[model samples]
Target: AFDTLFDHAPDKLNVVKKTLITFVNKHLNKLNLEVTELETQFADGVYLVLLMGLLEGYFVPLHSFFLTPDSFEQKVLNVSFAFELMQDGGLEKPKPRPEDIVNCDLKSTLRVLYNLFTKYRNVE
Candidate 1:
């Protein structure tokens, strides 16, 4: 049953949870540059809370489907693709040469975050 599988879906849930959490933790501060350090930390906390809420909502319904032997490979493949897209920006995009906060452009940062967030949302 779905309930049983979801309840025991450690492998599936672990992959999903880890991916989402890693993405949030990696990018939250980078995106909130207008704020003071303290404010940035606060924003990161709030964003993390929101991400957790989303993950919980997603996990409740889909965890079981991902855990099944039949769907596991496809799910993992999709998740891998999602992770690759997340990593590509920093790897391929033009970044400030000095790479300091003062030198970073807020609009560029916002655009990157918007694109990444949108892609993340569409990964289902």
Candidate 2:
């Protein structure tokens, strides 16, 4: 299931991105989930190669990242780690902001993403 989705990912990220935003906006607050927008957040380096699929316009690859509770927390540390690598970039915890990349009961971020991607791929 995973390999098929990963390997047969979409080539047009534009449609993918649009549907994702729609999904995020529609269900994010209603479902209390975090769907990171690749238009802004690209975790290519420390994230994962499948994470690159996001840049390639495949939102399915990011399912596991947001499934766990600690993903958002860890990403900050991941950022802090990169900062550390660049010489005391500072680990200062920035103030909280809205639209935070912050999860769900159906326990399937992948499902929501799939819906979005499919909606875009099929819809006009």
Candidate 3:
């Protein structure tokens, strides 16, 4: 399951990854947040949720996730909820597991963000 399932250009992947990062930063810059690394940085889900909120123009319910999840389980909860939020906001539900994301699966993270990038590319 670790191998990439489909064939795609490496340069294409880089372009999508960079576009998603830049897209996220466009919103995150308002909060003084910078996304330099997609894999590790988005693993915890704090900024992921925040980015979703910024994109969709909604605040997440406090009870839905942790403010600062220190434990792996809590982190997974946040990531899971982040995907759930994405679906609610009109993006299709993603195929990647929250656990995989917490494990720092770059492919998994990119899949999620690439969806966001395509859906919200013209958003703001």
- TM-score of every prediction relative to native: 0.25, 0.25, 0.88
Give the per-residue lDDT digits (tens) of candidate 3, residues 3-114. Answer: 3422456766676777778898998888799999887999998988998999999888778789789899999999999999898987777898899999998888877877
In model 3, residue pairs whose N, Cα or C atoms come closer than 3 Å (at least 3 residues apart or on different chains), thus clashing, are none
Instruction: Score candidate 2 by lDDT.
Output: 0.37
Error of 1 at 37 (Å): 20
Residue pairs with backbone atoms closer than 3 Å in model 1 (clashes): none
What clash pairs does model 2 have? none
Best candidate according to TM-score: 3
For candidate 1, report its TM-score.
0.25
Name the candidate, 2 or 3, with the larger TM-score value: 3
**Ranked candidates (lDDT, high to low):** 3, 2, 1
Estimate, for each residue in 1-124, the C-alpha lDDT of model 2 and write its tens digit: 5334434655644455556666444533343535465433323223322222322343433344433326656654443333233232232332222113222212123332453344334332
What TM-score should be assigned to candidate 3?
0.88
User: How displaced is residue 45 in candidate 3, in Å?
Assistant: 0.9
lDDT of 1 at 6: 35
